Amino acid sequence: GLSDGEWQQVLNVWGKVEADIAGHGQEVLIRLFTGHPETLEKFDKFKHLKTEAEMKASEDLKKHGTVVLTALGGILKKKGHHEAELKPLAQSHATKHKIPIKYLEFISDAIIHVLHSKHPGDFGADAQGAMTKALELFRNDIAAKYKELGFQ
Ligand code: HEM
């Protein structure tokens, strides 16, 4: 649960992402894959990437970063009223991709890391607080659907 002022901060931060969605998406995925190499094993189309240089050179990885962040941005713009947008993603991630909730924690922290790396000094403490709360809400509503499905 976020206040109106917290949602305003989230959507202000998101404007930074929307100026370069592919560059942000690329770096988020690279941070996830390099920090948590077991996550790479869930992607049949990226498991061939052995080095970060290969990851950086991959145009398909940048494409997937655009898909991921476009979906998250659509959810964030609903300011919590995201049941219809979140349900298919929870279902596909539990039943088809088999993504444990832990990996959604990993990517949440990676988004925070990337924002500080690309906007040092311009991602303030209030903005970090509000973005963190928004990613927690996203993760928590996915977790409720995971429990319904019995997925661990
Ligand atoms: C911010 C969180 C994330 C969002 C919004 C997101 C969004 C999406 C979307 C929109 C798709 C394509 C449609 C679909 O299959 O449902 C996708 C595919 C996928 N997601 Fe996620 N995702 C997230 C986190 C993750 C994480 C943490 C993992 C794995 C560690 C992951 C693994 C996958 C896989 C394996 C695919 C299929 C890729 C393919 O082979 O083309 N997702 N995701």
* Complete domains list, the chain, with CATH: 1-152 (1.10.490.10)
Distance separating alpha carbons of residues 47 and 96, to the nearest angstrom:
17
Distance separating alpha carbons of residues 36 and 21, to the nearest angstrom:
22
Distance separating alpha carbons of residues 64 and 19, to the nearest angstrom:
17
Is residue 84 within 8 Å of 136, Cβ to Cβ? no
- Indicate whether residue 103 lines ligand 1 (CB < 6 A): yes
Residues 37, 58, 136, 146, Cα dihedral to 10°: -70
Question: What kind of experiment solved this structure?
Answer: X-ray
Tell me the three state secondary structure of residue 138: helix
- Indicate whether residue 92 lines ligand 1 (CB < 6 A): yes
**Residue ranges for the binding site for heme b?**
93
Tell me the three state secondary structure of residue 117: helix
- Indicate whether residue 86 lines ligand 1 (CB < 6 A): no
Q: What DSSP assignment string belongs to 10-22? A: HHHHHHHHHTTHH
List the resolution, Å. Answer: 1.4
- Indicate whether residue 68 lines ligand 1 (CB < 6 A): yes
**Residue ranges for the binding site?**
64, 93
Q: Count other Cβ atoms within 10 Å, centred on residue 116.
A: 12
Give CA separation, 4 vs 110, 130, 139, in Å: 25, 10, 20
How much distance in Å is there from the Cα of 144 to the middle of ligand 1? 18
- Choose among 14, 151, 31, 8: nearest CA to 70: 14
Phi/psi of residue 66, each to 5°? -65, -45
